[PDB]
Design a protein around this nucleic acid. Structure first.
Ligand SMILES: [Zn+2]
Ligand SMILES: [Zn+2]
Lengths: 92, 56, 118, 143, 49, 69, 56, 186
RNA sequence: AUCGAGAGG
DNA sequence: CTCTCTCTCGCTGACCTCTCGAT
DNA sequence: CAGCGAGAGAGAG
């Protein structure tokens, strides 16, 4: 259908990407303090929108809970430990 | 505390406003020549120090 | 500088001085054609080049999403839609002077107040 | 600083000026080679104004160098002093006129007294050292 | 070397959307460069967007 | 609703579909499958022919496309 | 970053993280912090190797 | 596809940034000494110096690129015909000229083509490479970086098993040929 | 034995 | 000439512990 | 990778 496209890094240099699909819709106040500060994208045109930010992370990083709230080196250590951690590898 | 958090965000915002004003002055080229360093180097050092002071 | 190659053999012309009437003419070695030189300067060398502060500005360059959009406008276009880039030339001494191109004038307007050249 | 010299911002500026290496390559905006058949009459109008200034008291090809005002302002060097250093290196092989420092545009013109002129221009930009300790590229003032 | 490259790139993008042009093949145009690079090469990582 | 734009919670479903078709080892399987289907036959065909020349004479050996059990 | 517009010298583009660890890093902030941590780990390993040789 | 040989072409701009007489010479893969770019262009058949500079430089106006080219143009003014430029190549006569043409088709820009009649495209690509070299020398554009993931390629299991299989298949093919050569009895 | 890989601090 | 740099071009070095899998 | 150990390679008296 062409709703989605595959981009290489060289093609990525020429494109402009938005993390959140809510960035594109028009934005014509009170805010909860706990929510992290987001800089306005302030960009007219985006060629593409990232499907979800969490996809840049790996499988082990996808395991890690709230790594955005965590410091990154601890995330790396936990990825290695998670490879080391015991688990039922398969049902068979 | 919420009050201290508002002061925190205000401090960060003031640092950002100062950084943007310095950047505008760089764009206007109405920036004093600093001996022994490129003018871009001076801009980078000033912005970096601004952010460091904001965090501290 | 203007570089001239002779038309007959398409090889570079070399400077030559006529002493009796004291003028410079370009003579080519691959073929005997000799001509009068319009420009006084044989060779120039810029230690500091502003050349390339704007490189490859096209009409299509006004459409690319990666390029930023500014509020300011040139007096000639009188249209705000513009593209501002920092100097393409990579130098130890580089000015963070914004160079803007708007499509309707197709004229480059430069943020710096000091220089209005070109 | 020398003993008994404190808060000598001025003297420290002069020391910095004396120690930093300064080259003709550093000060020159642009090197240009014109061919001017007549010593009295040049095609460039600014050079003609310099010629009419030179009413006091060879090769026709000439090298014209444009040097940056801001560099001269930062440096201890003056355009007359720069031309003097060029003359000292040339030992009257070549003759130099300097546009006045008061003039808004400053042209330094050198006529040999075109391969020789080109190689001499390169030799002059790279090899001419003016008011500077050799190995020091930069000096800054601090307390 | 091609003239009017934007129209050709528009057509190429429509073909890739159709799938007539393979989605893996990468087509990159830079206007300053005046350069269009097409890479059918294997082994380049791509992300879906 | 088919006209209305998506949200992030909707984007997770597209992520789901992508993961279902590709799997998490899609690259390994794709490279191997392309190697078996096409690369193997091309490799066999390149430099395939063996030619022995006698002065009197010439024997040629070529290779049909490769079949994988 | 591919999300950032060209020729941006703002601290958010250059990697200044306004948010605290409690509020959470943005994706761009997280990637830049990951770059920093990567340099930290590489430098740590190199420092250990160099200092072992130096001590010997 | 087929045999893959990595080929490295080196274009070098001799002389320091302050030094005079900057010359561009490119070394051929099979030739001990770098030959001037203009000599290579003459060997290619693009004989006029203006044509060579037009291949190298896409825009006629800029003086700096032409000025940098002028020392090389002087170097190539000594050899003004294709036959001599092909002749002065490598170490070892007419066989050298023919081997020079063979080296030009197989070793210079091997990816674009390996056969004759394609010299103009190769010369234009070579001039493009000189143009990029000059853009970096002029400091208008900064040097390309090695650590760019788009330039990096991540070879998977399949292609590596493919090259291993090519090597093994070549050994087996050779062995079959040895068996046939060994015996006419079968 | 060797080599290789991986992992721990 | 000619020792005197002086600008090239070779090479040799760079904490323990525990699996395992191949030879 | 650098230095130090050499050797070409002038070299500026
Ligand atoms: Zn001619
Ligand atoms: Zn305008």
């Amino acid at each position: 259908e062409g709703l989605v496209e595959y981009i290489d890094a060289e093609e990525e240099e020429s494109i402009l990407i938005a993390m959140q699909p809510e960035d594109l819709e028009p934005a014509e106040l009170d805010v909860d303090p706990a929510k992290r500060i987001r800089v306005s994208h302030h960009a007219t045109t985006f060629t593409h929108c990232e499907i979800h930010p969490s996809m840049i992370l790996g499988v082990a990083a996808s395991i890690i809970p709230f790594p955005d709230h965590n410091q990154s080196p601890r995330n790396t250590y936990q990825s290695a430990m998670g490879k080391q951690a015991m688990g039922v590898f398969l049902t068979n | 505390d919420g009050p201290t958090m508002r002061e925190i965000t205000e401090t960060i915002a003031e640092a950002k406003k100062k950084v943007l004003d310095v950047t505008k002055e760089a764009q206007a080229n109405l920036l004093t020549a600093k001996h022994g360093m490129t003018l871009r180097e001076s801009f980078e050092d000033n912005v970096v120090r601004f952010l460091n002071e904001a965090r501290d | 500088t203007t570089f001239r190659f002779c038309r007959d053999c398409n090889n570079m012309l070399y400077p030559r001085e006529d002493k009796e009437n004291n003028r410079l003419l370009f003579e080519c070695r691959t073929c005997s054609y000799v001509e009068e030189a319009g420009s006084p300067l044989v060779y120039r060398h810029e230690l500091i080049t502003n050349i390339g502060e704007t490189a490859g500005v096209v009409q299509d360059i006004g459409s690319d999403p990666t390029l930023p959009r500014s509020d300011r406008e040139c007096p000639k276009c009188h249209s705000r839609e513009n593209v501002f880039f920092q100097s393409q030339q990579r130098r130890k001494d580089t000015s963070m002077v914004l160079f803007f191109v708007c499509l309707s004038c197709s004229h480059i307007f430069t943020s710096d107040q000091k220089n209005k050249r070109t | 600083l020398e003993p008994g010299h404190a808060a000598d911002q001025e003297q420290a500026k002069l020391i910095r000026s004396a120690i930093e290496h300064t080259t003709l390559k550093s000060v020159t905006i642009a090197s240009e080679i014109y061919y001017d058949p007549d010593p009295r009459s040049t095609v460039i109008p600014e050079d003609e104004e310099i010629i009419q200034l030179h009413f006091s008291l060879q090769s026709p090809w000439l090298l014209r160098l444009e040097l940056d005002r801001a560099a001269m302002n930062d440096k201890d060097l003056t355009m007359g002093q720069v031309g003097e250093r060029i003359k000292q290196t040339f030992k009257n092989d070549l003759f130099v006129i300097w546009s006045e420092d008061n003039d808004e545009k400053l042209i330094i013109r050198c006529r040999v007294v075109d391969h020789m002129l080109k190689k001499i221009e390169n030799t002059m930009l790279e090899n001419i050292t003016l008011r500077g300790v050799e190995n020091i590229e930069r000096v800054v003032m601090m307390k | 070397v091609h003239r009017n490259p934007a129209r050709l790139m528009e057509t190429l993008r429509t073909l890739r959307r159709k799938g007539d042009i393979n989605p893996e093949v990468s087509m990159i145009r830079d206007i300053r460069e005046k350069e269009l690079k097409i890479f059918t090469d294997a082994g380049r990582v791509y992300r879906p967007l | 609703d088919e006209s209305a734009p998506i949200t992030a919670e909707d984007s997770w479903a597209v992520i789901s579909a992508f993961f279902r078709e590709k799997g998490l080892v899609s690259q390994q399987l794709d490279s191997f499958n392309q190697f078996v289907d096409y690369t193997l036959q091309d490799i066999i065909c390149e430099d395939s022919t063996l030619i022995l020349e006698q002065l009197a004479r010439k024997y040629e050996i070529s290779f049909g496309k490769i079949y994988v059990t | 970053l591919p999300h950032f517009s060209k020729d941006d010298y703002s601290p958010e583009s250059k990697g200044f993280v306004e948010n605290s660890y409690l509020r959470g890093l943005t994706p761009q902030e997280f990637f830049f912090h990951a770059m920093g941590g990567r340099e930290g780990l590489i430098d740590t390993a190199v420092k250990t190797a160099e200092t072992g040789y130096i001590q010997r | 596809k087929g045999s893959r040989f990595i080929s490295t072409l080196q274009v070098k701009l001799y002389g320091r940034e302050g030094s005079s007489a900057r010359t561009i010479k490119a070394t051929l893969p099979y030739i001990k000494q770098d030959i001037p770019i203009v000599i290579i262009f003459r060997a290619l058949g693009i004989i006029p110096d203006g044509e060579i500079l037009e291949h190298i430089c896409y825009d006629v106006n800029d003086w700096q690129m032409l000025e940098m080219l002028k020392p090389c143009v002087e170097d190539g003014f000594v050899i003004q015909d294709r036959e001599t430029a092909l002749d002065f190549i490598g170490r070892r006569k007419e066989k050298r000229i023919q081997y020079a043409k063979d080296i030009l088709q197989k070793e210079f820009l091997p990816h674009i083509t390996q056969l004759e009649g394609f010299e103009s495209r190769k010369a234009f690509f070579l001039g493009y490479m000189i143009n990029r070299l000059l853009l970096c020398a002029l400091d208008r554009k900064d040097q390309d970086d090695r650590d760019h993931f788009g330039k990096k390629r991540l070879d998977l299991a399949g292609p590596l098993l493919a090259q291993l299989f090519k090597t093994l298949f070549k050994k087996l093919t050779k062995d079959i040929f040895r068996y046939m050569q060994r015996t006419v009895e079968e």
